[PDB]
RNA sequence: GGUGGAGGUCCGUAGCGGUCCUGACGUGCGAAUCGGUCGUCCGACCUGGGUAUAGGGGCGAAAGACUAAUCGAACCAUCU
RNA sequence: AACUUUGAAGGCCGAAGUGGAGAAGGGUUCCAUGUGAACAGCAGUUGAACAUGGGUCAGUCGGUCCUGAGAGAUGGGCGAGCGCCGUUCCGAAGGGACGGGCGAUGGCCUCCGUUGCCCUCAGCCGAUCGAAAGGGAGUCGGGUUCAGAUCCCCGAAUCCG
RNA sequence: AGUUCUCUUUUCUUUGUGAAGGGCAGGGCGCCCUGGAAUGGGUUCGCCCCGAGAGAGGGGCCCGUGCCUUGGAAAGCGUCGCGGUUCCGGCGGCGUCCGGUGAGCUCUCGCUGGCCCUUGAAAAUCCGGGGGAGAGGGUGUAAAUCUCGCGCCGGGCCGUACCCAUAUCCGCAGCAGGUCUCCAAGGUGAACAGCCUCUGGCAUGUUGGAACAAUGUAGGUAAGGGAAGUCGGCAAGCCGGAUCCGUAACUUCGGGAUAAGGAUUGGCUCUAAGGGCUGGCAGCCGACUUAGAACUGGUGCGGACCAGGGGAAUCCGACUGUUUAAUUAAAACAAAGCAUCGCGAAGGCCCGCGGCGGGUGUUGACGCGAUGUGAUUUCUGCCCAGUGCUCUGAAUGUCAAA
RNA sequence: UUAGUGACGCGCAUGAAUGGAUGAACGAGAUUCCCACUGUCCCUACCUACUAUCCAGCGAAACCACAGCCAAGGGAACGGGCUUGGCGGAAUCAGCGGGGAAAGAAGACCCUGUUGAGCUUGACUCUAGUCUGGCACGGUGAAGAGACGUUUUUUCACUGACCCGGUGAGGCGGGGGGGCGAGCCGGGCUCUCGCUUCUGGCGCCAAGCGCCCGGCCGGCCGGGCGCGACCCGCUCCGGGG
RNA sequence: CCAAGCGUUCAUAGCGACGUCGCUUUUUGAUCCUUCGAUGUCGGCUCUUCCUAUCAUUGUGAAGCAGAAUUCACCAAGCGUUGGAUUGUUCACCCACUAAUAGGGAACGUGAGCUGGGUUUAGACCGUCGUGAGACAGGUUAGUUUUACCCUACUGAUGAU
């Protein structure tokens, strides 16, 4: 059944703290909880160890990352501009 | 009147660094032989988490050129970078998040983070997690790079600087609303002895040009000339404005 | 409809504190205690020892609070 | 003899104890016997008082060692100076060694040792201190005293060198 | 051993095995081999697992504090009976037995998860591995060598008594204060609550006797009324557990909430449902629960104990937290959030008599340093004259030493 | 109903992060009303425990000019004392709070003192720090602008004082030697490089070649040296200066 | 006290201008004599007593006293003079009953009698003021109330010549 309308995962801090904040940290709560895919292996198992640690149950693996995300859009943008700016350091 | 509190931090005291649980110095390697000429090849064993510290800290071990030895170094870790992984570091490994390059061999608009201020001090600028500087240009005749910070100025720096190829790991982590004293308690137990702070107005006028009065008043400018002596500069030190930023 | 068991979450014991009776006591059991009634009780939690900061100095979630019954500048001897 | 002791009643603390043990602190208050002057806000034949004598036994239980937060020499720097700063920082900071070559000495003089010199090899890079709750090998059962016992005795083990 | 007027095959007490070694249960495995899985399967309270190898077979390993065994019955204990110096580790007889059960409590071992802008010591010390410099003997009385089994010698120094707290410690004292810990029985009960009790302990807290005036201190009860008392419902009082039902405004949709408001509750005798073991059935074992029904008492039944009064509003502070030890616990402080300010290291801020001195800093702008406001929501208007801060400067008044 | 709530607003003297308006939850925070409840009250009573009480034992302290019955008078303007009256009778017990302008503490209020101390600033006099100029450490070479081969100054350089960073001060500068390319008519040169990028392996303590020496009997055993690993150099290498 | 007037008439039933004479110390002032080696500072609660400048009640005189109701005056303080909402309040105002709802003193009676609401320490908020520290007969909230066993007095209790 669904318990909650619309809080969510920040039903846990109840009423403190301000609707617009809790809003907030809802979409961070989610995403640092959630496990995503593991490219090294493919089972769905990374999950972070720290701020910006994610770890790999299956493969052991462990990759530097975001904060609250896997990989950050500013990071995901500099690999592809290191990638081409290789290139054409090397036509 | 007696000592302000911002005099007291300088004197070590309850004020010193909470170092017992961290890591270690974070650096590059040495510059030597092998990077000013050539690459050298390390390994990824792990990616830890350095207290006090926002970024995570890569443990890349090396060979040692002129002895039978592992080589154990504590990078900053660049997003992106894995356990297993290779990096290479010298004036001729390739463009490559995690890569130790000169600036001066990187194309225009290289991410860095972990950048050396000067040849040979193992990095100093953007090393904050999610950070990075940029390489604007180089000057060849006198050998030179103009890198952008994260801070938004432009440095002019020798080309013999180091760097690590990509963003620092970690980035984001301001995103998130603390939400909670207790939170914030816990950020600084492992950073340093500044949390929580008091007022100016809040005390007295013993300890504070700011303190006393029937009413919580500044009751004078708060915008304090730079060659204020210690204990009177507080506030604004040297401001050239005031308010809202409104427009660039 | 179940399962699950988060929380600076609630009632409440140990612990920690000390609201009111402006109760007791007030040449006291006590140079601050006693009783009922109360606050909190997984956290910014309580606590032992080790160590660090020393007097215009320290230390203060800030009351000019605390700094050995002494604090809007300790105590000891001298100046005297 | 209201108060000491033994016996019998009636009660209380009610396993977060008024129970059995420790740490810090005390320092003989512990145990036996004696006194009942002073003290124990009445008394006492009693006491943690007074007096006379005893009592604490370990490779294995702790200290001892390690390092923690830290404290702290030398080099160096400063300092009128007692000195202070400083802890790897402006240092020729190792007194060690497998092995090899030379001699000198020995003794179970066979050949092995020792000792002195030379060759060779050596990061640690910080003296020293810092915890009777942290780390840290290895001892348990039965008996035994007025008072000591994982310590004494009987037995059965174990670590280290 | 106790009770035995009556009853009670009854109630109480007690009914061992150390370290080390071996063996074996049991627990655990992210260990191996066969094999190839969708009609996907396996599996936990939850999960979670698999073509990077699941199910199913067969194995290997770690811990075994559990049971047996050597210890070891010789000892200890229970009990009955004899001895002696009788202050003997005195001597004998018998016994030290068999099952069950649990979300029970305490400790411990393990598996799996959640929290972190918190990631939760170091060193001494010990061990394995990789490498192959060397060494050993020439068929033997074989040698170097051995982390194997026995055997031989030793382990020095210091502490150790007792109290550990309504009388051995600190408060001038045998002071209702303070002062760090371990163990932890039966009943009721959700319970380490309160109430009673066993083991253990105590003698009422630095005195006794006789009275039972006033006034007190601490407890109670009061007809009728019900805040008329008072600055003020201060104080006391009402409520209170649990089951079933029911529950508003407002709300940041989480709450409000035990909202509010009702009913029920004893004892006794039954009924029904909820399981394991063995060989849609049969037999044997069981542990507490829930629900329903009859009967029943002077309507008493959460019978003591334990145990929220409620509602409608206004002000302030978002909350949790902190504070004047000993007259102020608060609206004060803090806080997350918000917004300004300085700084790219020859730096910002700060310490210091002094330095190639020190803190931030094992730091690097998502950082450090300095302020203000104070969650969320909506908003934050105009004023640069004043006072501050700041920016440009030989264009250019004043302006010290040299 | 001088209270509360809702409105009104020319508001002595409301008002926008000296934050304005709000608002769920929360509060030993302040206030008003209502239900329930009641000894708060009308209006008090009774009961229990410990006291007080009396006794045996034991036993302080605060305080005290002398003391201790009133009315009026006058008086330092409120007498226990004095004047004039009232009157006065041992020694004591339990209570009590009228008085002793009761005790307690050289009044905290107020003023004075040529007594202070905490704090502030646009008070007076200074001061650490800080910004700024000059002198010294303090050098070398070029130009440009001046002045009379010397000297003032501006710019650009240098390095050697001085400073900074790194390292276990580990390959720096120059040249040689070798390789791919270019292009002048096989050789010279513009001029470049210095052997590692697929995999979460391994990697030291020299192989090899050349030259000498020794020991035992050309064969056995053992040494040394050179290349391998280019030569020469004056600051370890960099950054400032 | 005088009496111009008011009272239809009528100065004095009841009033009373312009003037003038007193009393009192339940108002506030003025002064600064006592008290600064301290006389506890508002109000309420409780409790006793006293004054009369009499509201009621007893006995009376006079009215513009027919009755009823009321008004003025005399002897007069014996006995009474209440329950409440708002306010800390004294004061004030209103509700209700009543014969009446009079006015005062006692160190502005009464804190080793209470209470502590206000005032009036230290914490804190707002407004005005101040550059500021801070100020405000301006608001607001929280803020320790000690001692009797002595003498007298008084209340009772033995008792004394
Ligand atoms: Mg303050
Ligand atoms: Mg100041
Ligand atoms: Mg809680
Ligand atoms: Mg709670
Ligand atoms: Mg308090
Ligand atoms: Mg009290
Ligand atoms: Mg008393
Ligand atoms: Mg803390
Ligand atoms: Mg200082
Ligand atoms: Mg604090
Ligand atoms: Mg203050
Ligand atoms: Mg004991
Ligand atoms: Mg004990
Ligand atoms: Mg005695
Ligand atoms: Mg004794
Ligand atoms: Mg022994
Ligand atoms: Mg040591
Ligand atoms: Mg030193
Ligand atoms: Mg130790
Ligand atoms: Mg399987
Ligand atoms: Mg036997
Ligand atoms: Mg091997
Ligand atoms: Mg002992
Ligand atoms: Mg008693
Ligand atoms: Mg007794
Ligand atoms: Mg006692
Ligand atoms: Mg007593
Ligand atoms: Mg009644
Ligand atoms: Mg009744
Ligand atoms: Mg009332
Ligand atoms: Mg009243
Ligand atoms: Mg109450
Ligand atoms: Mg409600
Ligand atoms: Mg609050
Ligand atoms: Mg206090
Ligand atoms: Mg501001
Ligand atoms: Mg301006
Ligand atoms: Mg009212
Ligand atoms: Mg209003
Ligand atoms: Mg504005
Ligand atoms: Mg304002
Ligand atoms: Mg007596
Ligand atoms: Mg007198
Ligand atoms: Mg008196
Ligand atoms: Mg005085
Ligand atoms: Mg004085
Ligand atoms: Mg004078
Ligand atoms: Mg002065
Ligand atoms: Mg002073
Ligand atoms: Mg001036
Ligand atoms: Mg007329
Ligand atoms: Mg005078
Ligand atoms: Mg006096
Ligand atoms: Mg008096
Ligand atoms: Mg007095
Ligand atoms: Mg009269
Ligand atoms: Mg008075
Ligand atoms: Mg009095
Ligand atoms: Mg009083
Ligand atoms: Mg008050
Ligand atoms: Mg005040
Ligand atoms: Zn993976």
Redesign the pocket.
Same mark, same amino acid.
């Given at each position: 059944?669904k318990?909650?309308?619309?809080?969510g995962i920040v039903?846990?801090? %109840?009423?403190?703290? %301000?609707?617009?904040?809790?809003?907030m940290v809802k979409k961070i709560?989610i995403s640092?909880?959630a496990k995503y895919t593991c490219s090294?292996? %493919?089972?769905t198992?990374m999950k972070r160890?720290?701020?910006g640690i994610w770890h790999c %149950?299956?493969?052991?693996?462990?990759v530097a990352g975001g904060?609250w995300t896997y990989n950050?859009t500013?990071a995901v943008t500099v690999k592809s501009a290191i990638r081409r700016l290789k290139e054409l350091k090397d036509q | 009147?007696?000592?302000?509190?911002?005099?007291?931090?300088?004197?070590?005291? +309850?004020? =010193?660094?909470h170092?017992?649980?961290?890591?270690? *110095?974070?650096?590059l390697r040495? +510059?030597?032989?092998?990077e000013?000429?050539? $690459?050298?090849?390390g390994?990824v064993?792990?990616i830890i988490?350095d207290?006090?510290?926002?970024?995570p800290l890569a443990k890349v071990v090396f060979?040692?050129? &002129?002895?039978?030895?592992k080589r154990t170094e504590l990078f900053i870790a660049a997003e992106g970078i894995?356990? !297993?992984?290779?990096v &290479?570091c010298?004036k001729?490994?390739?463009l /490559?998040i995690g890569?130790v390059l000169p600036v001066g061999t990187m194309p225009e608009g290289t991410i860095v983070c972990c950048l050396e201020?000067?040849?040979?001090?193992?990095g100093?600028?953007?090393?904050?997690?999610? /950070?990075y500087a940029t390489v604007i240009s180089h000057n060849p005749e006198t050998?030179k790079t103009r890198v952008k910070?994260?801070?938004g100025?432009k440095?002019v720096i020798?080309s013999?600087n180091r760097a690590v190829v990509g963003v620092?790991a !970690?980035?984001?982590?301001?995103?998130?609303?603390?939400?909670?004293?207790?939170?914030? $308690?816990?950020?600084y137990?492992?950073?340093?002895?500044?949390?929580? =702070?008091? =007022?100016?107005?809040?005390?007295?006028? +013993?300890?504070?040009?700011?303190?006393?009065?029937?009413?919580?008043?500044?009751?004078?400018?708060?915008?304090?000339?730079?060659?204020?002596? *210690? !204990?009177?500069?507080?506030?604004?030190?040297?401001?050239? =404005?005031?308010?809202?930023?409104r427009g660039t």
């Amino acid at each position: 059944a669904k318990r909650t309308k619309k809080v969510g995962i920040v039903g846990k801090y %109840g009423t403190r703290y %301000g609707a617009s904040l809790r809003k907030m940290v809802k979409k961070i709560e989610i995403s640092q909880h959630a496990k995503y895919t593991c490219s090294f292996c %493919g089972k769905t198992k990374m999950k972070r160890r720290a701020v910006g640690i994610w770890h790999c %149950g299956s493969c052991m693996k462990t990759v530097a990352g975001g904060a609250w995300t896997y990989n950050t859009t500013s990071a995901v943008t500099v690999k592809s501009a290191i990638r081409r700016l290789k290139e054409l350091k090397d036509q | 009147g007696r000592v302000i509190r911002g005099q007291r931090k300088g004197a070590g005291s +309850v004020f =010193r660094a909470h170092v017992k649980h961290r890591k270690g *110095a974070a650096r590059l390697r040495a +510059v030597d032989f092998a990077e000013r000429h050539g $690459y050298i090849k390390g390994i990824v064993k792990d990616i830890i988490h350095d207290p006090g510290r926002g970024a995570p800290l890569a443990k890349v071990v090396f060979r040692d050129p &002129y002895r039978f030895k592992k080589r154990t170094e504590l990078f900053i870790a660049a997003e992106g970078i894995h356990t !297993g992984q290779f990096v &290479y570091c010298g004036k001729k490994a390739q463009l /490559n998040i995690g890569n130790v390059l000169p600036v001066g061999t990187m194309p225009e608009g290289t991410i860095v983070c972990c950048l050396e201020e000067k040849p040979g001090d193992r990095g100093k600028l953007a090393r904050a997690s999610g /950070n990075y500087a940029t390489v604007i240009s180089h000057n060849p005749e006198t050998k030179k790079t103009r890198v952008k910070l994260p801070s938004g100025s432009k440095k002019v720096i020798s080309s013999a600087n180091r760097a690590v190829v990509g963003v620092v790991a !970690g980035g984001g982590r301001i995103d998130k609303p603390i939400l909670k004293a207790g939170r914030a $308690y816990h950020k600084y137990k492992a950073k340093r002895n500044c949390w929580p =702070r008091v =007022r100016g107005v809040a005390m007295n006028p +013993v300890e504070h040009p700011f303190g006393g009065g029937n009413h919580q008043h500044i009751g004078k400018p708060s915008t304090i000339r730079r060659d204020a002596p *210690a !204990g009177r500069k507080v506030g604004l030190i040297a401001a050239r =404005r005031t308010g809202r930023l409104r427009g660039t």
